[PDB]
């Protein structure tokens, strides 16, 4: 499959090299390797493709100036970008377009993408706070508990419960971004009361951080 890497938090005006690495096949065969980005909450935007046979390249007119695609090895294609701004914050997908016979329109192999966050802020690990009903409320037989993952930069964080064994009733919301640019999200889970002491597992890879918070009602 395809795996993008090389991204993360970077300052405006800088430059970046993203790599797309193949496994179980290499670029000695005839494919197109295309780069497609997507700003958060917006549409797909084609950047350019490179043909693996003759390393011929084709760019979107808007992307010619600041973007470059090249085949550095039989298993790696790199996307070089320059003069980054906030408008370049996006997930950068690598996609393989295979031969259908008369054309190469079969783009059925996509990587998960590499997230690039263009900000002048410093990386910041999340502060995890428990979420439980008000102490003064009469408890019920079923209770919803959660964790507030507040003030981290950049995305993403991933949340599990009981190290991945508690998955029924879990609702992990997409992240919000406040004015200062820090991200936050919550994850709640419905469990039987006076029964399960639950623990959220918040991972922030950008700061090499993992936080476990054991939450309990009252």
């Amino acid at each position: 499959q395809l795996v993008e890497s090389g991204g993360g938090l970077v300052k405006p005006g800088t430059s970046l090299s993203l790599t797309c690495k193949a496994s179980g096949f290499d670029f000695s065969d005839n494919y197109y390797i295309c780069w497609v980005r997507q700003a958060p909450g917006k549409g797909l935007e084609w950047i350019g493709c490179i043909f693996t046979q003759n390393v011929r390249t084709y760019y979107a007119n808007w992307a010619k100036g600041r973007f470059t695609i090249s085949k550095t090895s039989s298993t790696t294609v790199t996307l070089q970008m320059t003069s980054l701004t906030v408008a370049d914050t996006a997930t950068y997908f690598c996609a393989r377009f295979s031969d259908t016979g008369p054309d190469y329109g079969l783009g059925n192999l996509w990587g998960p993408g590499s997230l690039v966050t263009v900000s002048s802020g410093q990386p910041k690990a999340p502060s995890v706070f428990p979420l439980a009903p008000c102490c003064g409320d009469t408890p019920s037989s079923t209770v919803t508990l959660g964790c507030l993952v507040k003030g981290y930069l950049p995305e993403p964080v991933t949340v599990t419960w009981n190290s991945g064994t508690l998955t029924n009733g879990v609702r992990t919301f997409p992240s919000v971004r406040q004015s200062s640019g820090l991200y936050s999200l919550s994850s709640v889970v419905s469990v039987t009361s006076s029964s399960q002491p639950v623990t959220c597992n918040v991972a922030h890879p950008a700061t090499n951080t993992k936080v476990d918070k054991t939450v309990a009602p009252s």
Partner: protein, 217 residues
């Protein structure tokens, strides 16, 4: 550069209905168009290539049509699992003669109208260790509902205009419902300067209010 004009930008249709999405290429590209499906947090997923060829494993209720300038994606027997954004893509450029995948259409957000469900609401007062940091964040959750809702925060009877951030989950692929989290951020001084905190979730003519008194938590 082929430019693709997608219509409509968003559509809502009942379960089992038919959704018709169309794209317009700026110049004739024959049958070289792919259609993609994307859900939040996931990578694009190929549905149709060559204008009308179904990708293996894609349900037969998806069908593509067109050759030349105008291309049509049809989703019949619409399911809650079809709630997503759909993109067309030109896969030929007459100027360069290459059959690579190029520009994408603007996209079409499809909302699947399922059976109505009123929300249940929960309010979470700030953990004890929050107030020492200078700010507090109050979480309010509306679970498993349809159609959309609107949230209102109140502090001692005064409607809150700022400090509010909302995030909605994608439509549940089984029952079309949403889940919403609403957070209200105040300074520790503002928070201690007030007693009553109220989250109010309104779904049309229905409202579910969830309050707590700072002293009692």
């Amino acid at each position: 550069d082929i430019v693709m004009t997608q219509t409509p930008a968003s559509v809502e249709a009942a379960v089992g209905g038919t959704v018709t999405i169309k794209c317009q290429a700026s110049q004739r590209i024959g049958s070289h168009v792919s259609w993609y499906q994307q859900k939040p947090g996931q990578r694009p997923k190929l549905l149709i290539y060559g204008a009308s060829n179904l990708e293996s494993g894609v349900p037969s209720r998806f069908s593509g049509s067109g050759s030349g300038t105008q291309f049509t994606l049809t989703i019949s027997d619409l399911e809650c699992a079809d709630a997503a954004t759909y993109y067309c893509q030109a896969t030929y450029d007459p100027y360069t003669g290459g059959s690579y995948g190029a520009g994408f259409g603007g996209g079409t957000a499809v909302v699947v109208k399922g059976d109505p469900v009123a929300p249940s609401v929960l309010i979470f007062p700030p953990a004890a260790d929050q107030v020492a940091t200078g700010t507090v964040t109050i979480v309010c959750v509306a679970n498993k509902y349809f159609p959309d809702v609107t949230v209102t925060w109140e502090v001692d009877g005064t409607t809150q205009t700022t400090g509010i951030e909302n995030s909605k989950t994608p439509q549940n692929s089984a029952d079309c419902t949403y889940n919403l989290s609403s957070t209200l951020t105040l300074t520790s001084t503002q928070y201690n300067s007030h007693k009553e905190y109220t989250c109010k979730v309104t779904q049309g003519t229905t409202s579910v209010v969830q309050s707590f008194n700072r002293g009692d938590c």
